[model samples]
Target: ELEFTEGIGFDKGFLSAYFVTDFDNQQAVLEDALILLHQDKISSLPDLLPLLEKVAGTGKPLLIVAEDVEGEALATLVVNAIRKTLKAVAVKGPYFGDRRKAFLEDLAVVTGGQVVNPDAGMVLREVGLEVLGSARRVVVSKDDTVIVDGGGTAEAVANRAKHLRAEIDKSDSDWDREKLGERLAKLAGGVAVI
Candidate 1:
């Protein structure tokens, strides 16, 4: 019913930095990590397959870029979810690191996408920009939908939204507390609790 274009970007530094800087908040860090893992479980696996099948069917392409191990694993989970559910071919980009290369390779192999080293010719900033740009340019029809969920505050959302909107107003999307509450109300067809 709709042509879909999707892009995902992950920052190795963000994860690693959080782990290092937030060492004191071990419990919080672990909780956040688990939450992220849970999201991947829902969005990139069996749960997501049926949704993808219903939405894109057999002709859609999903573009995913896993920056670091955490991101890589999440991407892999999604790719596997798609392949297992549909006759879809999932492509994954490179995974960085000597110790974790095998994990990334396995993900790429399973998803049928290629793996390239982040150190090769791609810088983190460049890759992030490219992924975000491409995602913004993806052609969407009236029937198409784009969903972006990540952990951050209103400031972060505002910053990214400002840049994305500046680049492409139509394709750019962001959510705040008020906007999210409104969305929940629409979904429930009534007032939202929070």
Candidate 2:
């Protein structure tokens, strides 16, 4: 049998300000979703339109993870979710600053997706779905999101987990070790959304 990881964590949950107005369930359950792991805040709807349309055409749900989602971008997502034009949910990236960037990188590896980071010369508007990651299922709750059976290859995921394990062993601080351990567990045992 193949070994896999299962991770559950609290970073930030679904965007409820607009979500509750339309969704009856406090949490969102998306199946066969295309996961968009972003490093920066998404505030413009136009920037998200092409990707939205692309995912919509696939007839699969979209799971958006970013530093933050606000303004017209968020409102449009809410509207689409309500209209059934798109089955989607947005969540805040876990943590902040460099740590958050690291976490998103880990998630990207686990999901076989790339982070849409301008710092990396990746543009949100111009990127294609090939950059997006995927999973068998995703659960976005009030305080966290869990990814099941990420589409990332076993070899790549295992390599990342191995690297994290070595880092944990080389580290001296208990705090950093704990954080790295948690991350390692997620990569080796479970895949989670922060």
Candidate 3:
């Protein structure tokens, strides 16, 4: 529920450049933030929780772009947290078999959400956007399964995935060894040679 005091827009390109140029500092900051948040040191829950509630209530699904970071696992954590606290469902897209898919699928199941794997003929951005535009938070019965519509060409999906990988490699924060493994797994899921 924490909100940025000042209006802040996160541009992937800008963050990529910053992280690439200031890897140590950026990593340190991330580590610190994670530590603080994980340790339950968030004293401003009242202020923060409301903002998160508002976001969930707004009906505009949150879209998390992992880019090249070790994010799928983190994304799973996020969606699960949101579901628990806000009673909202969050759909996640495939890590494209990026070894992270297993965790991602677990996240979906835990949060009562659905997972959609992007195929060769789809565009991940379009798929992500479309999911954000139409995600719902309904209860699923024992015999229920959710469907996600990916709205881009297979070639487009491949191209976008390729572009994203390159951008991640060029960033200041090189993927950690673990992140590399996950990314490689994701690539293998695609219909392309790594």
Candidate 4:
């Protein structure tokens, strides 16, 4: 393992790095968490989810930066679920392949983030998970549009009934002035499992 933050473009807190892999399984990598940030604490999804739901939830900009995307099917599912709960910025790079990569790409889209091959340094505005509970597995484009994967429900309830598109529109990325469902009624009509 080379170290998750082995880049000049990378620095500071809120690091969701997925890098420097020597482990064959995802659990190994996760357990070997990097505690380099001046801040303390980085918890797994299972532990973090409940806190997110609390009334005193940390309403800070959440960013899910995965430097690598290599993990189990279950790992992908967990990660997938994490992204939908919020429109967090997911910057992916290094340490990815095979089936795990597919999950990573999908994770970036649904969370309203971009999966760029890291090299250039990007200064992105900081950005949650309840969008996950209200939503299901679906697809979105890098340009900021939600293509609801048919079969899954498109609406999520935060307080009142709100469509997935509306929740995603509030995202910092992948937002378009036009509504995604307006042009293609078929997509909204349960057409895909993307």
Please list the C-alpha lDDT of all candidates, in the order they appear: 0.28, 0.81, 0.30, 0.28
Candidate 3's TM-score: 0.22
Regions more than 4 Å wrong, model 3: 1-51, 60-87, 90-98, 102-144, 150-194
Positional deviation of 174 in candidate 3, in angstroms? 32
TM-score of 4: 0.21
Clashes of 1: 1
What would the per-residue lDDT of candidate 1 be over residues 45-83, giving only the tens digit for each residue?
A: 443334343424433333333332334434544454334
Q: Answer with 2 or 4, whichever has the higher lDDT.
A: 2
Clashing pairs in 3: 1-48, 20-172, 98-186, 120-154, 121-153, 121-154, 122-153, 122-154, 122-157
Top candidate on TM-score is 2
RMSD of 1: 19.3
Candidate 1 local accuracy as lDDT? 0.28
C-alpha-based local distance difference test score of model 4: 0.28
**Residue-wise lDDT of candidate 4 within 1-194, one digit each (tens)?**
22222111212122222221222431112211111110112234453344334412433323333442223422432453355332233333222343234333333333323433322332111112232211222222232212232122333111112343564466465433232222122222322234
Candidate 2 structure quality by residue, lDDT tens digits, 18-96: 4432356677888888999989899998988888999899998898999898899998899988887888889998887
RMSD of each: 19.3, 3.7, 18.2, 16.5
